[PDB]
């Protein structure tokens, strides 16, 4: 045994609840996972969780640095988040500089891939984009296609889709697959007509990314052009709020509800394979009941972010346990981090695996339109990251 | 009436003298201006300068942070640098957060142009790229040109040439001129033939940016394709290094020297319109002297960066004087910065005018070949930022 520990963690997420991973939403996950870890660590150990606002931007680098200064030079033992690409950069870098471990269910951009230096203390629990591109690459090697057009949106602020398709690119690039790139700003004036024109100009297979509503518009504009008959193959990445199917992702209670249903017939959606388990149920229930008595409703099943942070917590308490046993202390940041890499464990929803680079393996699903008359949408296939194998559902 | 002041200055530049703005090459300039200034401010006032290696990267962020956090929570009174684009962003952000005034002869990219918030405390004493672009935009209106190609090297690291042409692009895209982009890594293998061929596809007016040698390469190949001589109008920006915009640019004591002179008959160079005066001569003598006394092989003299930081100090001092008159203190960076904005003062080389946005107005000149036989390259015309008039010479 050893004396009771006193772990200080700095959580950095956006207070703004308009984000799938805001504090209000992630906190419940952390606390839960924290109540389960106790009773791996010396009896009596405690956790002092500071929830600061990231504003999904600079603020994080600010709050982190001010604390470290006010505290007269003392830094936290664990840093969770940020999740936003631009915000997770400096914090990550500084964490590496200070030998502080940083775990995050965000920071999915392909740049955090190179952890030989800059991002050496970063461990990613959610599937990076590159992973999703490893899948598309596989999916592509299946239909035997070799060319593709990447059509995405770019707000020059958060650029979620820019980074998203960047993964498809980084991967398709290495393998040689040819790629046509077309970007546009949805927020600003939409000239969808152009999009479609270039599409019907470049390739016959298209991989898109933009707000669900923007994808609809593009699907219609192209439908009216009779491109939705079987000459083209449309795809759109929707990894976090993919649940509209089973009800109809085209349906909107809108008048265009019919054209939409038609066009979407040629539209396949790639999302995350979210497995369940009794545990996960109880977790989901409790996390839901909290966010709710807070003024927010939840998307039925907790999102991948909430699940990830829960598992993040464990993964840390799992590595601090091994580091301790060997003799070192919590202050040996890199040591801890190295423990969190290249391993497999039981998360709140099932198996979880972090590759030898500190990036979690991902599992994705593809949704298509099984019965056109009705507009029935169902997963036609799964792909398994670690395994490295794709497969059509029964 | 006032007590002796002790300004704590934090200079952030590269230790490596490969940069036209290394600490060793800039320190003298700073000290010189310091003497002249320490003899405006209260008697007994003393400057404490801290020269720290920016490393043109994250180092600059780390140093600043480690300095402040370590020794209390006391930040410096004035930060000088960094110059490098990527390394100035954080330091500038952290400075605008701590209400600290930040002056630099770099950070010329178009992003630091938005100061309604994150760069509120940044003043640029050297001509930004967007001004250099406003220059081109006038040259283009002059010749009735409305289209252009932007060919540049993109190392995906420091990326100076990319930021350079980004300025031209920002200005053109707004005014309506159409452009065609084209990037290549010059760190890798140069497919100079493809480049030249795409050029043959695009526009007749070509804006270029790359290593002095690379512009020459392309020039030979284009020449080989007969694209030189009247057909296309090549351009290339060389704003700082005198060894590059100096007459005989095409020479290399190489076998191609004849051919090169032949190609450059169509290549026009864009650089800064540096002025001089008696006092500047004294300055250059000492700066030259100090640099050599440090072993550093005298480049040629003082670059825009050196002359820039010298006038940077006079600018800070002029502003302190005034702010220290309205009943404010050295710790009110904001009040100090707004004082350095929208004004004109005497630098070592002459007039210096900062616009109402914290950006130094820039005056440019164009270098063309006036005798194909000889190889003579004299200045054809100039542009004056503030006035905004481009004028051809006799």
């Amino acid at each position: 045994a050893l004396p009771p520990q006193k772990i200080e963690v700095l959580v950095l997420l956006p207070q703004d609840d308009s984000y799938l991973f805001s504090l209000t939403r992630v906190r419940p996950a952390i606390e839960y996972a924290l109540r389960s870890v106790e009773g791996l660590l010396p009896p009596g150990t405690r956790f002092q969780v500071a929830y600061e606002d990231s504003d999904c931007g600079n603020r994080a680098l600010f709050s982190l640095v001010d604390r470290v200064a006010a505290a007269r030079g003392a830094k936290p033992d664990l840093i969770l988040g940020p999740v936003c690409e631009y915000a997770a950069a400096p914090v990550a870098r500084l964490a590496s500089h200070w030998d502080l471990p940083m775990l995050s269910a965000g920071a999915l951009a392909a740049g955090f891939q190179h952890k030989d230096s800059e991002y050496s203390h970063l461990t990613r629990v959610a599937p990076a984009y590159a992973k999703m591109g490893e899948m598309m690459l596989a999916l592509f090697r299946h239909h035997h296609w070799s060319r593709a057009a990447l059509v995405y949106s770019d707000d020059k602020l958060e650029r979620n889709c820019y980074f998203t398709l960047e993964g498809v690119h980084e991967v398709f690039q290495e393998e040689g697959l040819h790629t046509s790139i077309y970007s546009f700003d949805e927020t600003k004036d939409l000239d969808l007509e152009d999009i479609v024109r270039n599409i019907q100009a470049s390739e016959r297979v298209v991989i898109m990314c933009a707000s669900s509503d923007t994808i609809r518009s593009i699907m219609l504009v192209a439908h009216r052009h009779g491109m939705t008959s079987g000459d083209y193959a449309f795809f759109n990445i929707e990894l976090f709020n993919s649940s509209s199917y089973g009800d109809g992702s085209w349906k909107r209670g809108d008048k265009h509800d019919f054209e939409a249903k038609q066009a979407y017939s040629s539209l396949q959606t790639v999302t995350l394979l979210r497995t369940v388990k009794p545990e996960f149920e109880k977790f989901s229930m409790e996390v839901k009941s909290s966010v709710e008595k807070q003024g927010l409703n939840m998307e039925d099943y907790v999102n991948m972010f909430v699940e990830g942070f829960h598992d993040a917590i464990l993964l840390y308490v799992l590595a601090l346990h091994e580091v301790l046993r060997a003799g070192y202390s919590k202050k040996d940041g890199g040591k801890i981090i190295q423990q969190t890499w290249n391993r497999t464990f039981e998360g709140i929803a099932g198996q979880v695996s972090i590759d030898a680079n500190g990036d979690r393996y991902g599992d994705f699903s593809v949704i298509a339109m099984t019965d056109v008359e009705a507009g029935t949408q169902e997963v036609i296939g799964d792909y398994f990251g670690k395994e490295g194998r794709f497969e059509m559902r029964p | 009436a006032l007590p002796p002041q002790k300004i704590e200055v934090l200079v952030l530049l590269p230790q490596d003298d490969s940069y036209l703005f290394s600490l060793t090459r800039v320190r003298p300039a700073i000290e010189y201006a310091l003497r002249s200034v320490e003899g405006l401010l209260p008697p007994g006032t003393r400057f404490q300068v801290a020269y720290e290696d920016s490393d043109c990267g994250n180092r600059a962020l780390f140093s600043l942070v480690d300095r402040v956090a370590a020794a209390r929570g006391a930040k410096p009174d004035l930060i000088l640098g960094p110059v490098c684009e990527y390394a100035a962003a954080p330091v500038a952000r952290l400075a605008s957060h701590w209400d600290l005034p930040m002056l630099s002869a770099g950070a010329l990219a178009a992003g630091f142009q938005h100061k309604d918030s994150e760069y509120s405390h940044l003043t640029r004493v050297a001509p930004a790229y967007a001004k250099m672009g406003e220059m081109m935009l006038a040259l283009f209106r002059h010749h009735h040109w409305s289209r252009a190609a932007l060919v540049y090297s993109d190392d995906k690291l420091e990326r100076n040439c990319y930021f350079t042409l980004e300025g031209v692009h920002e200005v053109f895209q707004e005014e309506g001129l159409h452009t065609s982009i084209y990037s290549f890594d010059e760190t890798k293998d140069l497919d100079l033939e493809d480049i030249v061929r795409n050029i043959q596809a695009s526009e007749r007016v070509v804006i270029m940016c790359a290593s002095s040698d690379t512009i020459r390469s392309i020039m030979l190949v284009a020449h080989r394709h007969g694209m030189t001589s009247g057909d296309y109008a090549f351009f290339n920006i060389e704003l700082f290094n005198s060894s590059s915009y100096g007459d005989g640019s095409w020479k290399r004591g190489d076998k191609h020297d004849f051919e090169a002179k032949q190609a450059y008959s169509s290549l026009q160079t864009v650089t800064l319109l540096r002025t001089v005066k008696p006092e500047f001569e004294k300055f250059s003598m000492e700066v030259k002297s100090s640099v050599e006394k440090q072993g550093l092989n005298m480049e040629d003299y003082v670059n825009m960066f050196v002359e820039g930081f010298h006038d940077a100090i006079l600018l800070y001092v002029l502003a302190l004087h005034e702010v220290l008159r309205a009943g404010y203190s050295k710790k009110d960076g904001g009040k100090i910065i707004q004082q350095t904005w929208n004004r004109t003062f005497e630098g070592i080389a002459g007039q210096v005018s900062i616009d109402a946005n914290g950006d130094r107005y820039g005056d440019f000149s164009v270098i063309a070949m006036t005798d194909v036989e000889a190889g003579t390259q004299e200045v054809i015309g100039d542009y004056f930022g503030k006035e905004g008039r481009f004028e051809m010479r006799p």
Partner: peptide
């Protein structure tokens, strides 16, 4: 295309212009 061989400095500021070969 608009991605270049890499994007090393992802998460810095550079987001005012694309790339392409």
């Amino acid at each position: 295309g608009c991605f270049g061989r890499k994007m090393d400095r992802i998460s810095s500021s550079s987001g005012l212009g694309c790339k392409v070969l």
